[PDB]
Every structure is written in C-alpha cells, then in structure tokens.
Amino acid sequence: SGAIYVGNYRVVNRHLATHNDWANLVWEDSSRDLLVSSTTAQGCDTIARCDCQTGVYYCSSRRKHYPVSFSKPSLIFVEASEYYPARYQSHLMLAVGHSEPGDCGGILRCQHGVVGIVSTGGNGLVGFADVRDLLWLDEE
Ligand SMILES: CC(CO)(CO)NC(=O)Nc1ccccc1
Ligand SMILES: CC(CO)(CO)NC(=O)Nc1ccccc1
Numbered sequence: 001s002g003a004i005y006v007g008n009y010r011v012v013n014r015h016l017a018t019h020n021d022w023a024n025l026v027w028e029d030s031s032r033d034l035l036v037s038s039t040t041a042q043g044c045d046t047i048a049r050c051d052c053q054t055g056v057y058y059c060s061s062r063r064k065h066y067p068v069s070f071s072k073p074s075l076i077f078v079e080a081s082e083y084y085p086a087r088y089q090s091h092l093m094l095a096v097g098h099s100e101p102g103d104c105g106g107i108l109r110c111q112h113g114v115v116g117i118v119s120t121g122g123n124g125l126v127g128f129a130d131v132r133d134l135l136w137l138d139e140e
C-alpha cells in the first residue's frame with residue numbers, strides 16, 4: 001500500500017485505486033499501473049524532475065529502506081500478476097531488490113523528491129512506476 005500527495009492530486013497504483021479515486025479520477029493508464037485522483041486538502045510531496053538513476057525505496061515486506069540503482073523508465077515485459085495479465089508495462093524502472101505484491105505503493109525517492117512507486121516484483125527485482133514525466137502534477 002501507499003500513495004504520493006502533491007498539490008491536490010493523490011497518485012496510487014491503478015490496481016489499488018478506491019471507489020473515491022475512480023469517483024474523483026484525473027488520469028489513469030493501465031499500461032503504467034498509475035491512477036491520479038483529486039483531493040480536498042493539499043499535499044507536501046515534491047515530484048522529482050531529474051534523470052537520477054540512484055535513490056531509496058521503502059520495502060514494507062522487509063520494513064526496510066534500501067538504496068538502489070534503477071534503469072531509466074522503459075517499456076518492459078511483466079509476467080502476469082493477480083491484478084494484471086502478462087503484458088508490456090510502460091514507464092517502468094527496474095532495480096535489484098526485494099518486492100512482493102503488498103510492496104506496491106512503496107515510494108522511491110532521490111534528492112529532487114518522489115521518483116516513483118513500487119509496481120512490479122519477482123526474481124529479486126523491484127519495478128517502480130515513474131511519475132517524473134507527469135510535469136502537470138506540479139501545477140493547477
Ligand atoms: C514512512 C513509510 C514507512 O517507512 C510509510 O509508511 N515510508 C517511507 O518512509 N518511505 C520512504 C521511501 C524512500 C525514502 C524515504 C522514505
Ligand atoms: C542518492 C540519491 C541522491 O539524490 C539519488 O540521487 N538519493 C537521495 O538523495 N535519496 C533521498 C531519499 C529521501 C530523502 C532524501 C534523499
């Protein structure tokens with residue numbers, strides 16, 4: 001579980017979006033496993049605006065923060081999961097680390113701010129859904 005709170009936007013994993021997120025939808029992309037909804041109150045998370053390939057993510061399944069190197073956002077083949085069919089996930093960054101399904105929503109951060117949220121795991125890899133390209137999260 002977990003989300004990013006920036007301006008009046010709530011960014012979650014699409015496969016974990018609630019009634020209210022769908023009721024208050026702004027943007028979703030199944031291929032990115034992302035959904036942005038609107039929020040009453042204002043958030044304090046800054047979205048990174050950078051091409052950093054080093055960061056730190058929270059792994060709920062280890063109650064541990066791990067420093068990691070991660071590939072640039074790419075179109076990656078992701079083996080089928082409970083919520084998804086085996087498909088090409090877009091804007092996905094891969095690191096070596098531990099990730100189980102419940103690790104989704106775990107934030108990846110660099111010095112510039114929030115880079116992504118855990119979206120994929122398996123075979124000692126962790127996959128993060130990039131949000132740095134969503135320049136529109138910083139305004140309105
Ligand atoms: C507080 C908590 C649990 O530790 C959410 O329950 N998450 C974090 O602190 N995530 C984090 C990720 C990368 C860098 C810094 C922080
Ligand atoms: C190594 C580096 C430096 O930017 C990646 O570029 N990571 C961070 O600075 N992580 C960080 C996480 C939470 C709070 C503050 C910093």
Ligand SMILES: [Zn+2]
Pocket residue numbers: 048049050051052110111112113
């Ligand atoms: Zn950065």
